[PDB]
C-alpha cells in the first residue's frame, strides 16, 4: 500500500511509512493463542482487558498505555502455555505497569498497581512478573498499537495546508467515537486475526466511507473487507447503544482529554455483538 503521508521536511514519507509497516511484520499476534491455555475461555481475556480499561480511566492513563498493555498481554500469553486463570490479573496489571512506565510522564507508583487488585497481587509479585514479561517479549515493547493507527489516520484526514504531521490537528469527538468501537472489538480475541492498522482502518470505515478509509490508510477494499465484515455486529451494537461524549478529567487540559482511556459496560455490548 502507498503512503497516505504528505511530503515531510524531517524524513522521506515513503521510508517513514515502510518503517511503520515493518512493525506489523515484526510484532506478531495470534487469534488462537488461548489453544496453548486450553482451560482458559476467551471471556476471561475480555474480563481482564475490560478491567485494565477501568483501572486506566481511574488513574487517567493514556489510551496508548492501555493498548501497549493489551499488546504486551496478548504477545506474552502467546509465548507461554497452561497459564492458570488465577494469574491473568497479575499478568494484566504487570503489563499495564510496564506500559505506564514506558508511556506516562508521572505513572502511578507500584503501590497503586498492587492496590487496584484488592489483595490478589503484591508489589513483589508485580516486580517478578514485569521481568518475566519483558524477557519473554525479548524487550520488544514498541508496537504500533491499534490506537496509534487511529491517531495517524485522524491526522491525515484533517491535515492543514502546511501539511503538518507532528502537531495534532483533528477533532476530539470523531476520535473517541472510533476508539470506543475499537475498545469493544479488542475484547474479542478474534480481533487479533487482523493487523492493528486494518482493525483501526475498519472501525474508521464503519464511521465514515471507503473514500476516507483509502485516503488515510492507503488500503484497498480487498485488504480490509474481511475485518469490516467481522466488525459489522460491533459497529451495530455501538450505533444502537449510542456513542459516549468526551469526558473532563481532573488535571487534564480539556483539549487533551480525548487521549485519556475511558471505560463503559462493554461486556454487555460484547455479548450482544458476538450473539449475532
Amino acid at each position: 500500500r502507498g503512503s497516505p503521508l504528505p511530503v515531510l521536511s524531517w524524513a522521506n514519507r515513503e521510508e517513514v511509512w515502510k518503517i511503520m509497516l515493518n512493525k506489523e511484520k515484526t510484532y506478531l499476534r495470534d487469534q488462537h493463542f488461548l489453544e496453548q491455555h486450553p482451560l482458559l475461555q476467551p471471556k476471561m481475556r475480555a474480563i481482564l482487558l475490560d478491567w485494565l480499561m477501568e483501572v486506566c480511566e481511574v488513574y487517567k492513563l493514556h489510551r496508548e498505555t492501555f493498548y501497549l498493555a493489551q499488546d504486551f498481554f496478548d504477545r506474552y500469553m502467546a509465548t507461554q502455555e497452561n497459564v492458570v486463570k488465577t494469574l491473568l490479573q497479575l499478568i494484566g496489571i504487570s503489563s499495564l505497569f510496564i506500559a505506564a512506565k514506558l508511556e506516562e510522564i508521572y505513572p502511578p507508583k507500584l503501590h497503586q498497581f498492587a492496590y487496584v487488585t484488592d489483595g490478589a497481587c503484591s508489589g513483589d509479585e508485580i516486580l517478578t512478573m514485569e521481568l518475566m514479561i519483558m524477557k519473554a517479549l525479548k524487550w520488544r515493547l514498541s508496537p504500533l498499537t491499534i490506537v496509534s493507527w487511529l491517531n495517524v489516520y485522524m491526522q491525515v484526514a484533517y491535515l492543514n495546508d502546511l501539511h503538518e504531521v507532528l502537531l495534532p490537528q483533528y477533532p476530539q469527538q470523531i476520535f473517541i467515537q472510533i476508539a470506543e468501537l475499537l475498545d469493544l472489538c479488542v475484547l474479542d480475541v478474534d480481533c487479533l486475526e487482523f493487523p492493528y492498522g486494518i482493525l483501526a482502518a475498519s472501525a474508521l470505515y464503519h464511521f465514515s466511507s471507503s473514500e476516507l478509509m483509502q485516503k488515510v490508510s492507503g488500503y484497498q477494499w480487498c485488504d480490509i473487507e474481511n475485518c469490516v465484515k467481522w466488525m459489522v455486529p460491533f459497529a451495530m451494537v455501538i450505533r444502537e447503544t449510542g456513542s459516549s461524549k468526551l469526558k473532563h478529567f481532573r488535571g487534564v487540559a480539556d483539549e487533551d482529554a480525548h487521549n485519556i482511556q475511558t471505560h463503559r459496560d462493554s461486556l454487555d455490548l460484547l455479548d450482544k455483538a458476538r450473539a449475532k
Binding site: T26, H62, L102, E130, L131, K138, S142, N151, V152, L166
Partner: protein, 286 residues
C-alpha cells in the same frame, strides 16, 4: 560472568564499567541496575533505552549487545568504544579538532539523528558526553535513557528535558509541544562547541540560559518567531538584544559551515532545518 576490567563512571541508572566476555574475550561497557534498590522495579529510563535499542540499529548509534538478569541485578551490555567526544576534546589530542574531522563528526551525528527521527525516536539529551568515538573515526549516539518513541502526530511529553546547556528555547519558554527540532538545536550547540572548544551557551539557570541565547541570536519577536509572545514562560520584560554576527563567534569555520550553524540554531522550531535537510547542505558537498 563478565571480567570487570575497570569502572568508567556513573549513569542515568546505577554505575558504568569496561569489561570482557570470558567465552569470547570481547570488550563491552556495562550499566548495572540494583533491582533491590528500585522501589518501582526496572526504571522507565532503562525500559525505554532497552526497547528502543532492540530495534534502532545504525552505524552512528551505539549497539546494545545483551541484557542479563542475574541475582537481583539487571546488566545492560553495550559495545565498548574508546571514549566520548567530551573526554576527547578535554585531552591533548582533541584540544584542536581539524576542520575535516569537525565536518565528518557532524555529518555522522546528523546521519544518526536523521535515522532516529525517521524511526520516530527523539533523543532529548544530545551533548558531547553522549557521543562515543572509536579509533577509526566513527562517532555514535549513546545514552537513549532520556529518549522517547513519539507518535505521529505527537502529544505533550516531559516538560523539562535536555541537559541545560544543549536545551532548545521552545523548551525554556515552556511550549506545550516540542518535536524532533529539540535534537537539531542540541546538534547546533555541539557543532559550535567542536569549533570553539567550549560550550556555546553555558547557562547557570533557565533564565540565564535563555539570556545567553538572546544575547547571541537577538531577542525573538512575533516577526522572527510567530507565537513566541504567547509562550507560557515568555515575558515582555526580556531585554531586546540584537543578533551578533556569527563570523565573530566561529571565525575559523568556513562560510558554508557558518550558514549551516545558523540554520541549526534557528530559535523558531518551525523554521529550524531538519537533520535530513542538513545532510544535503553545501558544507558537506565536495
Amino acid at each position: 560472568m563478565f571480567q570487570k576490567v575497570e569502572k568508567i563512571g556513573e549513569g542515568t541508572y546505577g554505575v558504568v564499567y569496561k569489561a570482557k566476555n570470558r567465552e569470547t574475550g570481547q570488550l563491552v561497557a556495562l550499566k548495572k541496575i540494583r533491582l533491590d534498590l528500585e522501589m518501582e522495579g526496572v526504571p522507565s529510563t532503562a525500559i525505554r533505552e532497552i526497547s528502543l535499542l532492540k530495534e534502532l540499529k545504525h552505524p552512528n548509534i551505539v549497539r546494545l549487545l545483551d541484557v542479563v538478569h542475574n541475582e537481583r541485578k539487571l546488566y545492560l551490555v553495550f559495545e565498548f568504544l574508546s571514549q566520548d567526544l567530551k573526554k576527547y576534546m578535554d585531552s591533548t589530542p582533541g584540544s584542536e579538532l581539524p576542520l575535516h574531522l569537525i565536518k565528518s563528526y557532524l555529518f555522522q551525528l546528523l546521519q544518526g539523528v536523521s535515522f532516529c527521527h525517521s524511526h520516530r525516536v527523539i533523543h532529548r539529551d544530545l551533548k558531547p558526553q553522549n557521543l562515543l568515538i572509536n579509533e577509526l573515526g566513527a562517532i555514535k549516539l549513546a545514552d537513549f535513557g532520556l529518549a522517547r518513541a513519539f507518535g505521529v502526530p505527537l502529544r505533550t511529553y516531559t516538560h523539562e528535558v535536555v541537559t541545560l546547556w544543549y536545551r532548545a528555547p521552545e523548551i525554556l519558554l515552556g511550549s506545550k509541544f516540542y518535536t524532533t527540532a529539540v535534537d537539531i538545536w542540541s546538534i547546533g550547540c555541539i557543532f559550535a562547541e567542536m569549533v570553539t572548544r567550549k560550550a556555546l551557551f553555558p547557562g547557570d539557570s533557565e533564565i540565564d540560559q535563555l539570556f545567553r541565547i538572546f544575547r547571541m541570536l537577538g531577542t525573538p519577536s512575533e516577526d522572527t518567531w510567530p507565537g513566541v509572545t504567547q509562550l507560557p514562560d515568555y515575558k515582555g520584560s526580556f531585554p531586546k538584544w540584537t543578533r551578533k554576527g556569527l563570523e565573530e563567534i566561529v571565525p575559523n569555520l568556513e562560510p558554508e559551515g557558518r550558514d549551516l550553524l545558523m540554520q541549526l540554531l534557528q530559535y523558531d522550531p518551525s523554521q529550524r532545518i531538519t537533520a535530513k535537510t542538513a545532510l544535503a547542505h553545501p558544507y558537506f558537498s565536495s
